[PDB]
Every structure is written in C-alpha cells, then in structure tokens.
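Hey,

Quick one before I head out. I ran the complex with 5,6,7,8-tetrahydrobiopterin overnight. Inputs first:
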Amino acid sequence: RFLKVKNWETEVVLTDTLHLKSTLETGCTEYICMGSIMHPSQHARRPEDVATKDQLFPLAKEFIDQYYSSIKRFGSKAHMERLEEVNKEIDTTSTYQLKDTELIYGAKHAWRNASRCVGRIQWSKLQVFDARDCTTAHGMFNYICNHVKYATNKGNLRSAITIFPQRTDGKHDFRVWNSQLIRYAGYKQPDGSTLGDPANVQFTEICIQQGWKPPRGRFDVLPLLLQANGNDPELFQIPPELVLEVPIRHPKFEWFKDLGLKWYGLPAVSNMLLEIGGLEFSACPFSGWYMGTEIGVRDYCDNSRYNILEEVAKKMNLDMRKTSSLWKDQALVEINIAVLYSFQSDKVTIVDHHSATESFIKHMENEYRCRGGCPADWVWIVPPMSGSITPVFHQEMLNYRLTPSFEYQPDPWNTHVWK
Amino acid sequence: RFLKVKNWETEVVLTDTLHLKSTLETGCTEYICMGSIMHPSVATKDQLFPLAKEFIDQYYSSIKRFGSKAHMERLEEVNKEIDTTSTYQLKDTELIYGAKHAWRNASRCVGRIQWSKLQVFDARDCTTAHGMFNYICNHVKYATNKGNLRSAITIFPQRTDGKHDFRVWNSQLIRYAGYKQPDGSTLGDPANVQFTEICIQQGWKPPRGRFDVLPLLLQANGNDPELFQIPPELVLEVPIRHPKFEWFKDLGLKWYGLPAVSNMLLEIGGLEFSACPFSGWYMGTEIGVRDYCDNSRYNILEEVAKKMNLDMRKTSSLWKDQALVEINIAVLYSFQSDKVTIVDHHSATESFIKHMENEYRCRGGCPADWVWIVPPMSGSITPVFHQEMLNYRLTPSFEYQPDPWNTHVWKLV
Ligand code: HEM
Ligand code: HEM
Ligand SMILES: Cc1cc(N)nc2cc(-c3cccc(CN)c3)c(F)cc12
Ligand SMILES: Cc1cc(N)nc2cc(-c3cccc(CN)c3)c(F)cc12
Ligand SMILES: C[C@H](O)[C@H](O)[C@H]1CNc2nc(N)[nH]c(=O)c2N1
Ligand SMILES: C[C@H](O)[C@H](O)[C@H]1CNc2nc(N)[nH]c(=O)c2N1
Ligand SMILES: [Zn+2]
C-alpha cells in the first residue's frame, strides 16, 4: 500500500512506495512504537557466523539482482553469469566476493539508506577505498592514514569510506576498536571526576592498559587500536600532521578563546558494520564533515560529556540561580556560534543545522521523485537545538530498513578471546 | 513479556509491563515506523459491552474492589442499559476516574505529573448552547484563579446517535483572531484565520486588531452553533516584556494566561464525550517558540533579530537561534512578574522524568511520545532527550476528531 507523508509548514505531500522493499523489522508493532529506542531490533539476516548455502545465497541473489536492476541490465548475460559465479563461490568457500563496481554501489547505497543521517544529499559523492587485500594491523594503519589524509584534504573535506576484508567465520574479524578514528581521551580522576572526554574513559583505559603512555590532558588524541584477521589489537599513533584541529574562538566575546577549547575537523565513525548481500564488513571507517551542533551541542554540552555550559554561563554574567532565566539555552547558542565561526575562519568544511536540514528536505523530495520514498528517522534528523525553527521539524517521515545498510555491532572487547 | 527502556545519560533502566494492556493501534507496523506522523490510524450494542466491561473492570481494580458484589452489580446494570437503551451512563466516580486517566494516558503530554489533581466539572445535564456558555465561563474562572492556575475539565453530555453531538467549535477556549488582508499579510494570529472567518460569517463583528479574543462558538444537541462573548474580565492576559531589552515592550506583544483545549474527544468505556474542554498552565516554549516564532504564526523572529543588531545575512550567525532564546526569556519573565503560573521547559522535562520513573514503579509503565515530549528548542540539554520511551495507546484516552464545520449539516434558513 502507498503511504503519504506531509509537511505541515508547506502542505506538500509525498507518497511512499519504497517501503514495500523494506527487509528488517523496525522493532515496532501495530500496538507499540519503539521509534526512540536506540537499538530497537536485533533482526539480523543470518546466523552471526558462517551461514549455510540456503541462508547466504538468497541474500546475495537479492543484492546482485538489485545491482543489475540498478544498471538497466536485469536478466542480462553478466547478471545470469554472476549468479552462477556466486553460487560456485558459496559452494566452494561458504562465502563470495564482491566486484569492485558492486562494492561501490553497495557502499553508496548503505549511506543512501541510512535513515538517521541528515547529510545524505551527498550520498553518490562517496570515495570508496578498497582495502580488502589488507592482512595485518600495520596494513590497516597504512590504509587509515591514507583515508585521513585524503578526506581531510587540508580542510576542504571529502567523504570517504575504507573497506577492510569481510567477516568470514567470526574468529577472524577485522576491527577498528576506536569508535571514531580521531577522538580525545578521558581520564578518571582521583577525586572521582573526569578529565578529557568522558565518553572515552573506558576506551582510554583500555589504551593505557595496552601500553599507551597518556599525556593526560584535556584534548589527548587517542591512539588507533587495530585488529586484523582476529588477532589481538595493536596500538598506533596517528601522525599529528594528519590530524586537523580547529581552536574555538568567538566572533564577539574575546574571552572565549581563553577557555582553551579545540576540536578536530574530521568525523570518522569506525565502529559500525556495513552489510551488502549477506556479507558483513566489520571494519569500514567512514567520514564526512561535521554539522556544527554535533560538536557544540552534544560533544561540549551533554552532561556525561564535556559539560562546558557551566563555565560559558559564568563568563557571560548570567543568572544561574534558576532554570527559567534560560541561561543554559543562552550559552548553548553562543557556543555553537563560536564552533561555526572557528571552523569557517580556518576554511575547514562545516555545515550549520539550518543549511543541513534545508538540504535534507530537498534531498527528501529528490528521493520521493525518483525512488518512491526515502527512509528517515525524525528523532535523529531533527537537530538537538532549535528544533522547531528548522524545516525538518514540521516534516512527517517514514522510517524503515533497506539493504545495503550500516549496522551497529558490539564493542570488540566484550567479545574478544585474547591471545 | 517484559520490555525495557534505558536512559543514556544516567543508565537507569526501567521495565515496561503496562504495554500489554494496550489494544489500540499505533499505525506503526512491524516493518515501518510512523512515530512522526501527526495523525495515523457510532458503536452498536455488540461493540459496546466489551469496551464498557473493560473500563468497569479497570475501575473496580483501581479501587481494590475487583470481583466484589458492587463490581458484579455495576456490570449487570451496565449491560441492562446497553440492551434497553443502546448506551449507558457513567457514575460520577467513574467519570472523574476516566477523565483523570485519559490525562494520565496522553502520551504526548509532558505535564502529566499533575494528572491526579484534575478538577472535574460534570456538565452532562446541559441541554443548550447558553447552558454550555455558563459552564465554560465557570470553567475559565476557577481554572484562572487570578493567575494561580488550576487544572480542570468540563464534560458535556456525550455522543448518542452522532446526530445530537455537543461541540465547542473553538480549538482553544481563549485564542486570538486572525484576519487575512487583501495584500496577503495577516493581522493577529495566522493560526486561527479560518475560524475567524467562520465566526464573522455567523455574525461576529470583529474589532480587526492584533489581539482580539475570539468568541465562543457553542453547539448543543446537534443544533447550529451559537456565538457568545467571553466576559473580558475573565480573560487573564500577560503583556510580554523582557528583563534586559527595554525596547521589547514596544513590540506590543501579549498572550493569554490560560491554555484550554476544546476540540478533542474524551473516550471512556466506549462512550464518546465530543465536547470536553480542559485546561492547565503553559510551558513557556508553547508561547515563545511555537506561538511567536513558527513561520506560519506570529513570526517575530525577524523583528526581534533586527532590534538586536544580529547579522541576518548568513544563517551560520545563528541569529534565528539567538532571537528565539530571548523571546522565550521574555515570556517566562513576563508571566513570573505578573504571578501567572507557567513552567519552563527545563523544569517541566525534569518533572516528567520523575513522573515517568514513578509510573514505571507503581503502574508498570508510562506511554510517552518522544517526538512530542522533547521541547521544541534546546532539546539535547533537557533530560528527556536522552530518555528512551515506549509509545502505545491506553484507554480512556483523549482523541482527535474532525473539525465541526467539515461534518455539521446545517439547519437555519
Ligand atoms: C558529509 C557530511 C555528513 C554529515 C553533515 C552527516 C550528519 C549526520 C548526523 C548529525 C548524524 C547524527 C549523529 C549523532 O547525532 O550522533 C548522522 C548519522 C549517520 N550518518 Fe551521516 N553525515 C555525513 C556523512 C556521512 C557519510 C559519508 C556516511 C557513511 C557513508 C554517513 C553515515 C551515517 C550513519 C550510518 C548514521 C547513523 C547510523 C545509526 O546510528 O543507525 N554519514 N549523520
Ligand atoms: C498543567 C500543566 C500542563 C502542561 C505544562 C502541559 C503541557 C503540554 C505540552 C507542552 C503539550 C504539547 C503541546 C504542543 O507542543 O503542541 C501537551 C500536550 C497534551 N496535553 Fe498537556 N499540559 C498540561 C495539562 C494538561 C491537562 C489538564 C490535560 C487534560 C486533562 C492535558 C492533555 C494533553 C493532551 C491530551 C496533549 C496532547 C494532545 C495530542 O495528542 O495532540 N494536559 N501538554
Ligand atoms: C560520517 C559522519 C559525519 C558526521 N558529521 N556525523 C556522523 C555521525 C554518525 C553517528 C551515528 C550514530 C551514532 C553516533 C555517535 N556514536 C554517530 C555517523 F555514524 C557518521 C557521521
Ligand atoms: C491542557 C494543556 C496545557 C498546555 N500547557 N498545553 C496543552 C497543549 C495541548 C495541545 C495538544 C495538541 C496540539 C497542540 C498545539 N496547539 C496543543 C493540549 F491539548 C492541552 C494542553
Ligand atoms: C512533523 C512532526 O511530527 C510534527 O510537526 C510534530 C513534531 N513534534 C511536535 N511536538 C510538539 N510538542 N508539538 C508539535 O506540534 C509537534 N509537531
Ligand atoms: C533516547 C533517544 O532516542 C536518544 O538519546 C537519541 C535521541 N536522538 C538523537 N539524535 C541524534 N542526532 N543523536 C543522538 O545520539 C540521539 N540520541
Ligand atoms: Zn514506530
């Protein structure tokens, strides 16, 4: 059945047929909505490790069919032969291998399918680095360094994904143990408080426990912790010259630069899993450019993060006596003004939440026009500040799960059998 | 079957068993989620007993009287009525309980920590629009309480055959008129333009100004609705000024103190109360963010940013964001100075989190609509933003109904 979505600010209605292709459960039922659960479902597509032939082949035949349908070649010579080819590979190795073209289509369509991503207007501009030949942590580190250098591009950032060998039996997983390629360290204090970034206290302590000598500051770039083919992970320090960083100053308040804050320029998620025709790529660092709110709202102001609202209000001469002065809201805007101004001053790519949300509505129209729909997750698309004065707030959205996709995966130290 | 929700700021984990009690659809399916759709998707005898049995069993359970003599008698008494009359009548106790639980069950409402203190006015003896006006006037006075606002609902007879419905045509009991101009602009509140037209056509002579309190349009027993002017002295209003910007008062802005929604439908035990205006007090952002800053509303963001000298050339200045905060400060300060009840979005979200935990503890869950609970500004810095929530439809519930002018078949001339 068709389904309609409406924008209550413009009354534009869109009709969704794409959802008929959705594959995995969302977690919801007709009696219960789970649209604010972080991980609602666990509906995978095969047993975690090596499926049987009748379990893996259907998923592959699905993806190949879709890819050749994409390129106006359904049922053609290449398509029929490829099916037989994947049959014989599965028969002989219990898995199969993607062509380079199929790998790129797959990567680009996982992004296009990422319902939580406000940035997807860019989806077809992704640069894919094939690292499926990699065999060691050292090689993993080389591929990552090149990723970082390409994607940073001196501040004119470029979207990229690097794809390491697919999972095979689960014992031989490639993993980036860091959650992002570049994050700051968090240090548990003697008095019980925390220095650096609290999100990373546990990882930061794994690194120290692994032999990292922490400089023990507020903005200590963490080492890379890389796992190849199921071995114990290994530490690597990213060459500093490759880590672009922006000092936060404020266009008006000169005292702001004296708060001593900076953030890195490149967001690069490295703990997610990419899924293409039954194949699972457990290591696939991908990177873009920040929306300003990701730094200034969440990274700086969350309570279990940097928590600098506290101080920015003091230096602003604000009534911190009661909430109704809205001192939190007022500092929160100034901080985000500063992040945007600092990144733009240093000609480092960044997008504000007004431009980004506007782009996503344009993207949404585009998709409904040519594709029959566009999975979008209102809870994540709406920026965490000034929600209702952005155009996505008044936009109805359908959420559903298309493949290929990015998926979550457990932290490798919960499941790693050490050597 | 249990179900868990996590707070990702505090790691508190609550366990929802109450969700098994729902039997109303959400519009979500197993493979699509519709949690951001505004509106997803009369009874015969056969349909009615089970709904009534459901509510009566629930009521006698709530008072530790389940299976009692008085419980079984009420059930049989209810059955008799649905046979003899095709409907039935709620007791006064049942009505109060139902009214309060509909509030308790309203998943989009962040102010439900107050649910048990609802003052219920039984207006089921009403027969005419003039009767309705009297009841509403006494609702407004009382709830307003000279600025010390008190929650209250007034409940009118209930639907019978669909033909003799009571309706308040107003969407709230106090709203400002809106006049579209020949040049395309709008005077007053753009949100109420259509209802303003309806009133004018019914005979209302508008002052055609910025803050005209609309007249009540009251329908009783399925008759044509009638106009009535709320007595001006019962409409408490707050002039909006700002504690720092002495120029803010020059915007000439004011709002009414009493938010009082009147277009919804109250469902208790299969009975439909199509007129049931209810009221509480404001969260600031309802006025400061959605009333004055929604582009389709009073839209004073441009004007406020002007008078702040902000750089309005590029969005990344965040002038919009900056002007929004100041309006919302001015709203809270204005109400607190005139000692009219109001809650800011921080305090309100903190209270709802306490309320939710308590309701999991004592009730086994608490249906909540994250898309509506999260304030429309500064979301991530309020605790609900990080709170996982399960959404499902318990009854009694408040429900949406179609606008009366889209379905009313007229009588006069
Ligand atoms: C190019 C600039 C991009 C911007 C501005 C952007 C923006 C965002 C933001 C703000 C979020 C929510 C993050 C949070 O609040 O925690 C998000 C989610 C996400 N983004 Fe993007 N993104 C960009 C590029 C990319 C690329 C290149 C990929 C992968 C190819 C990607 C994949 C994702 C995924 C998979 C999620 C959510 C996954 C989940 O949790 O289920 N993004 N995006
Ligand atoms: C006393 C203080 C109250 C506060 C602070 C409050 C606050 C709110 C807010 C902010 C909303 C969202 C409105 C929007 O942003 O569009 C809401 C929705 C709602 N409130 Fe409350 N409210 C209060 C009292 C009540 C009472 C007394 C009732 C009924 C007896 C009630 C029933 C509802 C309902 C039914 C909805 C959502 C209706 C829908 O599904 O659209 N509220 N409330
Ligand atoms: C590529 C990219 C860019 C950006 N600017 N932001 C991004 C945010 C996420 C993201 C998704 C879910 C959870 C989290 C936080 N762990 C981040 C992500 F995957 C990729 C992002
Ligand atoms: C009683 C009460 C108090 C308050 N403070 N707020 C309330 C807001 C709504 C409401 C529900 C749906 C949409 C809208 C938007 N006009 C408002 C409502 F029914 C009742 C409210
Ligand atoms: C499209 C979207 O679902 C819609 O605008 C909703 C979102 N959340 C909301 N939340 C509140 N409090 N009030 C609203 O009107 C809305 N509107
Ligand atoms: C409980 C809630 O679903 C959770 O905190 C979500 C809400 N929306 C979000 N939205 C974005 N963009 N990023 C997030 O981490 C979250 N967290
Ligand atoms: Zn849902």
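Residues 164 and 354 of chain B are 42 Å apart (CA to CA).

Talk tomorrow,
K.
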